[PDB]
Amino acid sequence: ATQGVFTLPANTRFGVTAFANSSGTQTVNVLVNNETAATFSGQSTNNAVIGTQVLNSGSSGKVQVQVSVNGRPSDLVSAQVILTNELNFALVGSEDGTDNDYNDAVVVINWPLG
Amino acid sequence: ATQGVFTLPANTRFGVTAFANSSGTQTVNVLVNNETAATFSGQSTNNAVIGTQVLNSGSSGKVQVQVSVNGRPSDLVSAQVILTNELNFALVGSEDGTDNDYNDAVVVINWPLG
Ligand SMILES: *C(=O)C[C@@H]1O[C@@H](C)[C@@H](O)[C@@H](O)[C@@H]1O
Numbered sequence: 001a002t003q004g005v006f007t008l009p010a011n012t013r014f015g016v017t018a019f020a021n022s023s024g025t026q027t028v029n030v031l032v033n034n035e036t037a038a039t040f041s042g043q044s045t046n047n048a049v050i051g052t053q054v055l056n057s058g059s060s061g062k063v064q065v066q067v068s069v070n071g072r073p074s075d076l077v078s079a080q081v082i083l084t085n086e087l088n089f090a091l092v093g094s095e096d097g098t099d100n101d102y103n104d105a106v107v108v109i110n111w112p113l114g
Numbered sequence: 115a116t117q118g119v120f121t122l123p124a125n126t127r128f129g130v131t132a133f134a135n136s137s138g139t140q141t142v143n144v145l146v147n148n149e150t151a152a153t154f155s156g157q158s159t160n161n162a163v164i165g166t167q168v169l170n171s172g173s174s175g176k177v178q179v180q181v182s183v184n185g186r187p188s189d190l191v192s193a194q195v196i197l198t199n200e201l202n203f204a205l206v207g208s209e210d211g212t213d214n215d216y217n218d219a220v221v222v223i224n225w226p227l228g
């Protein structure tokens with residue numbers, strides 16, 4: 001099934017943050033209504049924050065996360081969790097190789113902000 | 115129900131990261147085996163990362179997150195979610211006031227690392 005796509009409420013500020021856990025340099029592309037609205041790039045095997053940004057979901061609310069490593073797309077896993085009917089997390093894991101730890105780039109989207 | 119307490123696999127490196135969305139200064143306390151292992155402090159209404167660290171879960175594997183503002187415990191919500199039976203997120207929201215957005219300090223714990 002499709003992974004890394006989330007429908008947010010329209011015109012809502014959300015946070016996006018990416019962590020790296022891989023010897024390969026990770027490139028995280030964040031799309032809002034199918035246009036790139038943030039890209040993060042970095043390399044770390046100790047969970048370093050390679051990027052964090054406040055974006056707006058815009059009129060469509062469509063947010064998509066992609067991860068690639070040296071040009072090659074990573075396999076993604078994702079889910080959205082909602083706590084006390086109010087606090088939202090959209091979670092993404094990715095695997096760039098074979099060991100299947102799916103932490104190579106870890107992306108966390110959270111809203112509402114403020 | 116108790117919130118903000120997670121049992122991790124023993125002796126396992128994990129990342130903990132906190133974001134702030136409040137007029138108040140957030141103080142996040144991360145306890146491992148009932149003893150303080152990290153403390154984050156900062157203020158932001160635009161989701162700024164007030165702290166990120168790598169810790170080890172140790173022998174018990176017990177990790178607890180606590181949040182306080184102006185010396186007052188914030189009310190917490192939490193859950194753990196596991197993707198492809200491998201990638202782990204322990205999630206915490208907190209409310210320091212009356213509006214119940216529960217984003218005042220947002221804490222994300224993830225493992226495995228590396
Ligand atoms: C390349 O060596 C594979 C790669 O980097 C490792 C350090 C480890 O993080 C692995 O999961 C990642 O796919």
Ligand SMILES: *C(=O)C[C@@H]1O[C@@H](C)[C@@H](O)[C@@H](O)[C@@H]1O
Nearest residue numbers: 114135136137210211213215
């Ligand atoms: C105090 O004003 C309450 C407090 O700060 C606000 C800016 C808002 O973030 C609210 O959620 C937080 O509890």
Ligand SMILES: [Ca+2]
Nearest residue numbers: 100101102104
């Ligand atoms: Ca991997």
Ligand SMILES: [Ca+2]
Nearest residue numbers: 021022104228
């Ligand atoms: Ca990895």
Ligand SMILES: [Ca+2]
Nearest residue numbers: 214215216218
């Ligand atoms: Ca609040």
Ligand SMILES: [Ca+2]
Nearest residue numbers: 114135136218
């Ligand atoms: Ca708030």
